[PDB]
Structures are given as C-alpha cells and as structure tokens.
Write a protein that binds this ligand. Sequence first.
Ligand SMILES: CC(=O)N[C@H]1[C@H]([C@H](O)[C@H](O)CO)OC(C(=O)O)=C[C@@H]1O
Ligand SMILES: CC(=O)N[C@H]1[C@H]([C@H](O)[C@H](O)CO)OC(C(=O)O)=C[C@@H]1O
Ligand SMILES: [Cl-]
Ligand SMILES: [Cl-]
Lengths: 470, 470
Amino acid sequence: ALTEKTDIFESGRNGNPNKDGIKSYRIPALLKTDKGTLIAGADERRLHSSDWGDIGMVIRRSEDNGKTWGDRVTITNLRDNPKASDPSIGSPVNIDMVLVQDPETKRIFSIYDMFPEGKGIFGMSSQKEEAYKKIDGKTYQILYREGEKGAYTIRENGTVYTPDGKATDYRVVVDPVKPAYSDKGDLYKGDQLLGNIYFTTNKTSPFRIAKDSYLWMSYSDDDGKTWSAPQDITPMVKADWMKFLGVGPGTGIVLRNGPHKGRILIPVYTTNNVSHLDGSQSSRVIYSDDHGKTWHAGEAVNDNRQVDGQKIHSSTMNNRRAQNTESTVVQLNNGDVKLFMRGLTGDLQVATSKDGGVTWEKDIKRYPQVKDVYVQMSAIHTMHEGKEYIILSNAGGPKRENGMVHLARVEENGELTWLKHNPIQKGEFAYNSLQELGNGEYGILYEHTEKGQNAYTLSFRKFNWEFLSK
Amino acid sequence: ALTEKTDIFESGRNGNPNKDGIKSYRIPALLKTDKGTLIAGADERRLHSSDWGDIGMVIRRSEDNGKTWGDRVTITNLRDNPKASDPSIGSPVNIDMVLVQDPETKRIFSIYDMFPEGKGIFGMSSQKEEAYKKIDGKTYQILYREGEKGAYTIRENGTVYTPDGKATDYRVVVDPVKPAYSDKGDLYKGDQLLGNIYFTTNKTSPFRIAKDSYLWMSYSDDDGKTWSAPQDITPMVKADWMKFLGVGPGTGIVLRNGPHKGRILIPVYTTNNVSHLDGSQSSRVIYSDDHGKTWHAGEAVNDNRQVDGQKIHSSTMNNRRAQNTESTVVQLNNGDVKLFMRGLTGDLQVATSKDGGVTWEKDIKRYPQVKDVYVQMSAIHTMHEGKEYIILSNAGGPKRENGMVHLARVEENGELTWLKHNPIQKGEFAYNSLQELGNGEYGILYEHTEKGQNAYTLSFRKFNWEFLSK
Ligand SMILES: CC(=O)N[C@H]1[C@H]([C@H](O)[C@H](O)CO)OC(C(=O)O)=C[C@@H]1O
Ligand SMILES: CC(=O)N[C@H]1[C@H]([C@H](O)[C@H](O)CO)OC(C(=O)O)=C[C@@H]1O
Ligand SMILES: [Cl-]
Ligand SMILES: [Cl-]
C-alpha cells in the first residue's frame, strides 16, 4: 500500500553541509504534469536551516512516477553579497515556492518570495520604503541612492533614471543571462559591474531597491527542464498597506468547474504595519484568469471577519489567535473553494469562497478531528469510484512530528466528513505536498529528519486507497 | 493702517445659540475672486463648538471689498439622523474647507472633509472598512447591509447592487435636489424613503457606507452664488493605508509660474493606522492639472524623511514631534513651493518642493522668530516695489491668543528672513485666512471671541503696508 521513503533532497548531518556543500533543504512542492512527470521543488538552503541566507529555488523531475529522479534544476539563485560581514545573512533571499500547471497552455509556474540581502521576514524595517512608481502609465521599480532622498527609477532596458526623470549612465540587469539568473539586479556603469541592487550592506554600487517583501514568478514550457527569468509580480498584487506578502508553499490549483473555470489559485498571506508577525498574518489567494499573464489579489479571509463580536480587517488587525497564515487550496465539485489555513487554534481551520477565491464566507470552520500544530499542510481533491474526497496531510503532533494523512468525504453542500486519519511517517514531520498519481495512487513530498540529518531532508512516498481506508 | 473688525459670522453668546439657531462658527477661508468679490467660508457649527455634529459648509459674499456682506449661502448641509440618541453626535459631518479659484476657468472650488454620523476624526474605528470597489474599471462606493459580510455597491443612477452583482430595488440619491443637498445619501426602496446611507445609529434603512474619512468637493461657476452638488473625490487621492485624510483649511493656490503653472494645490494631511492622531499626522498637497476635474495626491513631507537618525514614512510613522498637520501653501517667483505646517516644535516649520508640490526636499526649515502654538495658520505671496515677500498670520501665544501678522522677505536663495511681527487682534485668536486685496491692501478673516461669545466669531479686517512695517 505504502512505499518506503525515497530521499529526494538530502540535507547535511550533525550541523554540517552535505556533500554538495548544502546544509539544509526545506519547503517541498510536488507537481504532477500533463506528461505524467513528477516535479519536486525545494528551498536549497546552503548555509543553514533558517528562513534567510543563500537559498536557491530548485526542482528535480521524475519521468517514471517517483521511482528515479533526474538532476537538480535550479530555477533561481541570486548571487550573495561577496562583501557582507556575515554570510549567513549576506545574500538576497528567495524563499518558499508554489508550483502549478496551466492545464490548457501546459505552462508550469513557480511563485516564490524575494527579499533583498538580510533576514527575510525577520529583518523587515518598521518604516515603509516605496518600491514602485507609476510614470506616464508605466510602473517602474525605484532605486535609492546613498545620501539622496529621491526615488530613482529602473526604466526601459534597465536604464536608471534620476528622481527628476533624466537618463543616467547606470543600468540594471533586468534580463539576466547567467545560470540560475544569478546576474539579476547587477548594477553597471557602461560595461563595468559595480555591484547589485539587492545588496544592502558594504555596497560597492550607489543603488538599492526598497527594503521590502517581494513576490516573483518563473515559468517552464518544457515540463520543468528549463525556466524563464524571474518575473516581478509584486506590483500587480501588493497593496500599499501590506508589509509582508508571500506564498503559502506547496502546489496551487486551477479551477476545473463553475463560472471561474481556468482560474489559477496561489495561496498567499500578508502582514500589516500595525502588528506584523505578532497579530496580522492573514491568508488569501492571488489568481490569474489569463493563463498567468496578469495576477490579482483576492480579499483576505480576515477582511470584514467578525471576531469576538467585532469586525476586523487584514490591514488593521492585531489579533494573534485570529491569524491564518500559509494555507492550502481546493475546489469542490459544487464549485466552492476551500482554504485550509495554518493557524493557532490547535485544530484545522477552513474558509470557504463561493466566488472562485475572491471573497470568503463569514465563518471559518474548525475541525477537532484534524490537529494543527501551527505548521504548513497540503490538501488535494480526489475522485474515487465516482465519490468525492479530500486528502489532507500534516503533522499529527504534539510537535512537528508524526505525519498524518487525513481523508474527508465532501458532502454535496461542501461540508467535510472526516473518515480516516492514517500515520505515514514516525518521528520528525513538517511541510509536505500531496498529489494524485492517476490510478488510486497518491504521492507525497515531505520534510523529515533521522540519523542526525539537519532540518530537513525531503522524501517521497507513494500510497494507494488501501492505505487511505486503513 | 488697520481697520476695525467687521463680524462676518457671529456665534451665539454664553453657550446659547445665536438668532439663527447657530451656536458656533469655525474654520475661516477667504477668497478674492477674479471679479473682485470676497468669499468668506466657514463651518456653521449649529449645536456646539466641537469637531463634529451638525455642520454646514457656508459662505458670504462681499461686492465692496469687505465693507458689506450678503446673506449666507449654504454649499452643503447633510441632514441629521432624526433617530440619533445624542443629536450632538447624531449627524453626518462636513468639516474644514479650502477655497480656491481657477484663474483660467473662473470655477471656484470648496474642498472639505466628510464623515458619516459620529464624532468625525475622534470617532474613527480601529479597523478598516473597504469604502470603494472597482468593478470592471468603474469605481463604486460600497454599502454594508445589517447582518451581512458582503459589499453591496452604489452604481448608475444610485441603484444598489448585491455583492454578487445583481440590481436591487434599493436606490441612493446620488443626484440630490434639496436646498444644501440635504437629501444626499437618502435610501429609497421604490417610491419609499427608508433612511440615509450616512446614518450609523438607530438606522431605519438596511444600508450604510464604510465608517471612514472622506474628501468632498463642490464648485461654483457664478462667483460663489450657487454651488454644484458635492463630488466625492476620495477615491482619486486616498491610498489604502490612509486612516484620516482631510484638508488643511484656508485658501489653496494655483501655481503662477514654472512648468506646472496652472496646477491647483490643496493642503491636506493624513494619519495612518499605526499611530493615528498620536504620532502620524503628515502634511502634503493634493493637486489638479485639469482645472479641478481629476485630483492626485502628492507625497508627504514625511515620506522618506530622516528623523532622529532614521528614515520614516507617513504610512508607518509613530513619532509625535515629527508630525506636521494643517498647512498653508505658497509659490515663490523662482518656482519653489513652500509649505508652512502646523506642528509641535513650538516654532514655525516650513517644507520646500521643487517639483510643483509632488515631492519635498530633505530638510524642514524651522524659524524660531515665529512661534507656533499648534494651531492653523495662513500665508500668502505678495510683491512690494518690487521685492518678494510672504505674509503669514497665527496666534502669538502663549495659547490661542494675541493674533500676529508676520512678514518675511523671500531671499534670492528661496530662503526666508523674518522682518516684522505685528499684533492684529488681542485676546482670543485661532484660525485665519489671508488675501491680497490689491493696491497695497490685505484682508484677513479670523477666529476671535469676546463678551461671552461662543468659539468662535469670524471677523474681517483690512490692513496696508504701513501696518506691516511697524
Ligand atoms: C518567508 C518565511 O519566512 N517563510 C517561513 C515561514 C514564516 O517565517 C512564518 O510562516 C511566519 O510566521 O515559517 C516557516 C516555519 O517552518 O515555521 C517556514 C518558512 O520558510
Ligand atoms: C477634521 C477636524 O477634526 N478638524 C479640526 C482639527 C483636527 O481635529 C486636528 O488637526 C487633529 O489633530 O483641529 C482643529 C483645532 O482647532 O485644533 C479644528 C478642525 O476643525
Ligand atoms: Cl552594491
Ligand atoms: Cl438609515
């Protein structure tokens, strides 16, 4: 019923780097393509297991349903600041991905966070820095020059314009060409490399982007073999009030029925400037109706939500327990969208959208049958013999341990009836990503450590309906 | 040299209403029109002196340079909520106006704050309510229905639509016809008047607008005699992070030189959700480059301002002493814009814009020569044979008392040198509005009380250069 674990991304041991010089792997995403390929994505955390530093967005492909795996394809890996005093925080950061395939165009998307050099979500400034400027109907990324108040802009061809709208002799690499696109943001004067717009300390160039939270996208048209250069989707989806805006890691969905059929959903979450990570983490989705060309923000589950007899908003809330963070998204046969949200209640929180993920119903459903220890989860839709189900995997607890696979029957009204709860991994268990394999078989890429492994090694297992019914 | 005061708007005495049933007048604006008319604007605060309640936006006209004044013209006066428990707070609020005339079109504009029923800026909720929705490129004001989470919208001809986009048979009066437009916001179901969308308590209708801060505009094309219905300009200028956004009352300007000549400038200020009135009040201007048709927000003086070693932003700041609030705007002959801002340093703070009010230079200039007791001021540009000056008026202190007219020379540098400091009114003195009358004469309209008069009576004086030279 259930296979042995095949390690896909292997972490180092006892606090040391593995043989490739990588201490850590984190944040699995598992995608089954139209060819039948399995794409396994991960944070490649070179220097340590923490949520920052030098991190590549990496995939491996299985052209045989999880039996054997090809070599690592690196989607994006921004080069580190060679002059940073502390290399553990000395790199521009990419962190956390969501994979999805457009079932019509066959395009595969990787959407992931981006920060300039520093500590990621843990090094955000208290004060807003404007990141973008609209000039004659065009949106440009801003640059700040040391000692100057004014907003420089990156305009056509990467050419840097002054605050007062004059071209300079500086340009930015806006069309990176190097492997892993490690030249992105490089700042030139002519053909002299000066530095990089993502460096924040001990800079050798005069320019940097706003110290903010960004959202990037990369895509593949050849089943995950090669990848586009990073596309900055931030200004399409990030409101002025948002502090953090980042993905809920794993695998997104494409709506298969109802008025919004073909819509791509990407779970994300925000914080605000009132209470940031202490009281404002709020789930929502971004979506595309045009096959991934343009992106829109849905409303938050927390927007106009009644809490303890009073209305809150994702932009103003300061309520630790009312937060919802990383989430996993599923569309039902009746057309409802369910959002399963990592939260702080001890048990499973679920929001429902009747309009394709744009707005959410007033109640969040809490399911005591499914434990949540405040950790990522995944959930997928599945049809077994014409009956409708959802499979959800997360840690059983009491800590980030004991991988549980849950089975729910979905009722005609969209309610969830939990049937079975089946252990899939003893010991350490954290982030995971489920897929349908196409028989009655299901795949799962997850975080687990054993035998002194650094957090985490990411492993793959198959399981059938015989395992689910147990 | 200095004329006796002419009382333009007289308040009641000893806490009682005046003959017209008005306890209080506040917030003077004075405008000299192309025809030579003087328009004196005010808040007509019927029930009490505070920053809320039943308040009309009113003017009087003088056709003989301030000697005699006509009857009150009411621009806007929203009807009260007849079912409110406390009438003192039982009315939709208009408060604080800025007057300006377009010298080309001759159109006169009054721009002023709007709040639904409540305590205005002191009654704002801690949580954001979305106020507008963009549906298919069109911006509609949102309505909320009792016991429902969704956003209804006010669409063409005031037809209320359901959250899911269906016409109902509820209608909002979006083209008011009653004197002073007191019918604006009225909620109909067919022929039947049910209540008003600006009412917040003991409602007789199912709908209300978001509890928020709004910005409204009315205009006159007949020299102040008649006025358009209010135009809700909020969505053009109010960013999503903004809590309060309202005018710095008095008289705005039209830029007379430089590449932005013809641009209309209106002083405003905002708060944010981090610190609201405790630490975030931030001066800026909104402006129109198409004769009042569309409006844009400039950047705050506080945006990317260095304060005590560190950069702040108007959207995120929490710094009491770094606030700048109501302000008055002046263009110099060299093209620079000066913004004189009410603040908490005890002396005069001035910001400079080199791009027609869009962005501000890094330093705020303080002038110890001019005390600021934290009260509104007004300032105008003037020429004197043929040297460039600015006249500024405010309280001398210690409190809101001893009105002063200050005179500065505008240096070849754009710097200011304070030459003269002349008392103009003993006893109580608060808000005021200056105008150049022609032939070396100036007019001022200002808040003063005596003989038990309620705060305040608005009185007018004229003065010439010899008054200034003392
Ligand atoms: C962008 C980022 O920091 N992502 C990290 C996320 C985040 O810090 C938290 O969700 C904020 O509350 O948390 C975790 C975690 O294992 O708990 C892993 C993610 O890689
Ligand atoms: C919209 C509004 O409330 N305007 C009021 C303003 C405001 O309350 C303050 O600037 C907040 O800091 O203050 C004053 C005042 O005499 O001090 C008068 C205005 O009518
Ligand atoms: Cl650099
Ligand atoms: Cl009502």
